[PDB]
Design a protein around this ligand. Sequence first.
Ligand SMILES: Nc1ncnc2c1ncn2[C@@H]1O[C@H](COP(=O)(O)OP(=O)(O)OP(=O)(O)O)[C@@H](O)[C@H]1O
Ligand SMILES: [Mg+2]
Lengths: 48, 49, 181, 158
Amino acid sequence: CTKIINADSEDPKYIINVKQFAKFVVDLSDQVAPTDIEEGMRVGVDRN
Amino acid sequence: GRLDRKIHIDLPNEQARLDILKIHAGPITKHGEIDYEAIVKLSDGFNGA
Amino acid sequence: KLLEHKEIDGRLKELREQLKELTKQYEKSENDLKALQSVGQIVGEVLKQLTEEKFIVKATNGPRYVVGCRRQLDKSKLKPGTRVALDMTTLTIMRYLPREVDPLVYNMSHEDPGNVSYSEIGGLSEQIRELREVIELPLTNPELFQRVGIIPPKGCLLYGPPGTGKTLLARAVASQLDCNF
Amino acid sequence: TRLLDSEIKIMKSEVLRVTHELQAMKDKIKENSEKIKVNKTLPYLVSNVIELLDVDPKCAVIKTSTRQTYFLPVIGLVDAEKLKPGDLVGVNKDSYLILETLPTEYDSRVKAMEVDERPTEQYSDIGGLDKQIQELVEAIVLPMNHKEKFENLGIQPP
Ligand SMILES: Nc1ncnc2c1ncn2[C@@H]1O[C@H](COP(=O)(O)OP(=O)(O)OP(=O)(O)O)[C@@H](O)[C@H]1O
Ligand SMILES: [Mg+2]
């Protein structure tokens, strides 16, 4: 579980922050719509 | 040996007040006659601000 | 008359104009592919050398290692305390670097778009002289105090009621003096 | 001498060869672009730039978000003219090279305090505060829409 911090337009390219590891740039999965991805709320994240 | 000099910057005097007024009231587009003496007398304990 | 090649010559000229951009693109692709065949190196600090080929170095973090060095590198510059770069898979000395400068100190070094001079500040023509007696004259003509037999002071502080012109005086001094600040 | 067809044939052959070379170069460029786009694996590592150090025979010194200091003999895919000490950059996870530059980030608490839904209250529903309203509006709203009335006189707003 991680926390998104912000986003950018025309491509998801979401910035993900975690408490102990580093922060990354990521995208969604296939089955999730980009509507309910509002910033500043906890999200699930793969291990790889 | 650490802070050798202590410098005091007190409130302005009448001459200092007149100097600051002449510095700051210059650029404004004034008109007519101006008398700084009354302004200096009235403003007591003021600052540059 | 002799324009039998003129059309073909113009076609060749247009093709050469296109080939100019095609060669710029080939060069750009070459730089892109060449750049992506390098790796970074860890940064650490040397402590001492055990023998001719063995040093002991400390990374920025904790762990300390006993490592070797490159053969062509000079060994006369590796005094204790210097900063070195090590390989990330074998941890061998590769290069020495100059001292670090913090980004905070770099930002602090130069930030002053103001250009306030001594004409915009008035009423305290004596304290300004008292302050300039400390930081200006000794830094340029230092043999006078040595002749008299004293040492000039180091620091000073300014105090008073709020809004009497302290930060303004500091800005004027910083903006009207040619020295590191 | 008289006119000869040799010039026309030579020019036509040169034009055809140059066009074919341009097509081949375009194909090679497409292949190289495909290879470059293959190396852009999406997961980056956000990091901070410490120094754009200059060396002689530009090299970067960076500080990754995982508390590791790295030295890069080459910058990467981003030009060194648009980098300052303290910039935020995305770095390849393994090769550790700069891949793109990111906008400056702000704290979530700071971002959450900006208004989104404007209130619907008007000036008409406040009674007995005319002087206060006039004194407040001439110091906040006025210096925004009527700045030309100020520098024409030489007076700074409150
Ligand atoms: N002698 C002076 N001449 C002209 N302006 C002055 C003078 N003293 C103060 N001021 C005015 O003071 C304003 C800001 O003052 P300044 O920032 O120096 O405050 P201060 O005395 O350091 O107080 P504090 O830091 O405690 O708030 C300037 O914009 C300037 O107009
Ligand atoms: Mg101040």
